[PDB]
Amino acid sequence: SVYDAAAQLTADVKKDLRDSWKVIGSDKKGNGVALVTTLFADNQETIGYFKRLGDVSQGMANDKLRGHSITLMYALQNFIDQLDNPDDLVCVVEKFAVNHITRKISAAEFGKINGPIKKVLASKNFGDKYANAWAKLVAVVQAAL
Amino acid sequence: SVYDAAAQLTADVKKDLRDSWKVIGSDKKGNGVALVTTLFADNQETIGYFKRLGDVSQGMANDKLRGHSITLMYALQNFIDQLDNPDDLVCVVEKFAVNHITRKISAAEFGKINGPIKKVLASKNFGDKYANAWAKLVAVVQAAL
Numbered sequence: 001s002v003y004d005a006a007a008q009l010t011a012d013v014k015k016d017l018r019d020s021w022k023v024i025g026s027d028k029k030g031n032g033v034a035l036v037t038t039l040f041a042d043n044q045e046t047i048g049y050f051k052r053l054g055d056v057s058q059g060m061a062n063d064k065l066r067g068h069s070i071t072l073m074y075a076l077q078n079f080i081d082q083l084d085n086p087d088d089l090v091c092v093v094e095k096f097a098v099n100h101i102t103r104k105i106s107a108a109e110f111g112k113i114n115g116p117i118k119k120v121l122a123s124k125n126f127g128d129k130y131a132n133a134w135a136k137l138v139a140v141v142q143a144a145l
Numbered sequence: 146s147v148y149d150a151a152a153q154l155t156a157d158v159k160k161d162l163r164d165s166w167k168v169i170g171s172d173k174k175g176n177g178v179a180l181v182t183t184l185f186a187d188n189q190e191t192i193g194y195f196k197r198l199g200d201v202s203q204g205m206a207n208d209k210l211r212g213h214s215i216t217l218m219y220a221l222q223n224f225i226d227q228l229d230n231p232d233d234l235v236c237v238v239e240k241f242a243v244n245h246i247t248r249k250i251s252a253a254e255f256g257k258i259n260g261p262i263k264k265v266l267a268s269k270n271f272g273d274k275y276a277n278a279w280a281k282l283v284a285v286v287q288a289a290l
């Protein structure tokens with residue numbers, strides 16, 4: 001249940017999400033491309049789903065990949081801004097869930113983003129505590145897939 | 146080209162866009178729903194395109210419509226944040242253009258959003274100068290359709 005999952009975002013979890021987002025969200029282009037390209041590097045088997053972006057190995061030089069990555073960071077911005085109101089967080093999560101359901105992305109494969117998030121966070125000196133907080137946010141989307 | 150339309154946005158136009166966005170972008174749920182519902186009210190012929198959202202006459206109560214409307218405001222947030230780097234503005238504009246090209250939305254039809262934008266701006270006392278600035282931003286997307 002997406003609602004029960006949203007209920008797992010306690011005061012402490014919300015605070016860790018906001019504190020870490022202040023840093024990672026400050027460079028959406030740089031950190032977004034880092035996040036997406038790490039997903040491709042660590043899970044080569046997912047590249048097939050991103051056929052529209054062309055040659056993803058080009059990273060930042062690929063305009064479609066850059067546009068996609070920046071936009072992905074605004075989806076995360078959206079989630080963070082809705083943390084105060086569960087009903088609104090749920091309706092935006094379900095909107096993005098549909099974007100992935102139509103692409104045939106399951107909850108398990110969506111969860112493959114946790115590795116990249118942990119790595120990007122670690123590179124900015126945010127440890128497991130923060131990675132786990134972000135895993136709980138990702139879990140809300142998973143509940144909707 | 147889209148780059149041309151983007152590169153033409155002047156300092157004065159960007160200033161007007163940012164100043165008005167500070168206000169209308171401060172309540173994404175409220176102003177986003179107002180924007181979308183006004184489109185339906187003034188251009189009833191477009192309702193059919195949004196069948197995935199269900200009964201749009203439900204307004205704010207319709208969770209799918211609310212999720213869609215909030216997300217639309219983040220696309221605008223994205224655009225506003227990329228104003229000073231035409232290269233980044235172009236790649237995000239083309240990303241959203243694809244979302245509309247796939248739904249068979251023509252440049253002319255995309256321009257129907259100008260009426261609703263003008264009304265929402267007016268509700269916050271932003272006059273014609275501001276509506277014209279926003280029409281210039283919308284025209285950047287139209288260059289991609």
Ligand code: HEM
Pocket residue numbers: 039046049050051052053068071072075076096099100103105109110111112113138244
């Ligand atoms: C933090 C997690 C993620 C977020 C917030 C996210 C967000 C997004 C957004 C905003 C889009 C654009 C939707 C559209 O315009 O149609 C998108 C597209 C996509 N996402 Fe994700 N995504 C995430 C993780 C994943 C993962 C882990 C996979 C695959 C295992 C995945 C696969 C896709 C695919 C295939 C597309 C379509 C790309 C295209 O053809 O344009 N996403 N995602």
Ligand code: HEM
Pocket residue numbers: 099191194195196197198213216217220221241244245248250254255256257258
């Ligand atoms: C300020 C202008 C507009 C912006 C920034 C915008 C933004 C968006 C976004 C972010 C989406 C979601 C894309 C996806 O996840 O697939 C969307 C979907 C859509 N837009 Fe727009 N849009 C605008 C104007 C319009 C106009 C004027 C029309 C129609 C005449 C239109 C028709 C559609 C349709 C049919 C969908 C699909 C809805 C669904 O089934 O989920 N858009 N738009």
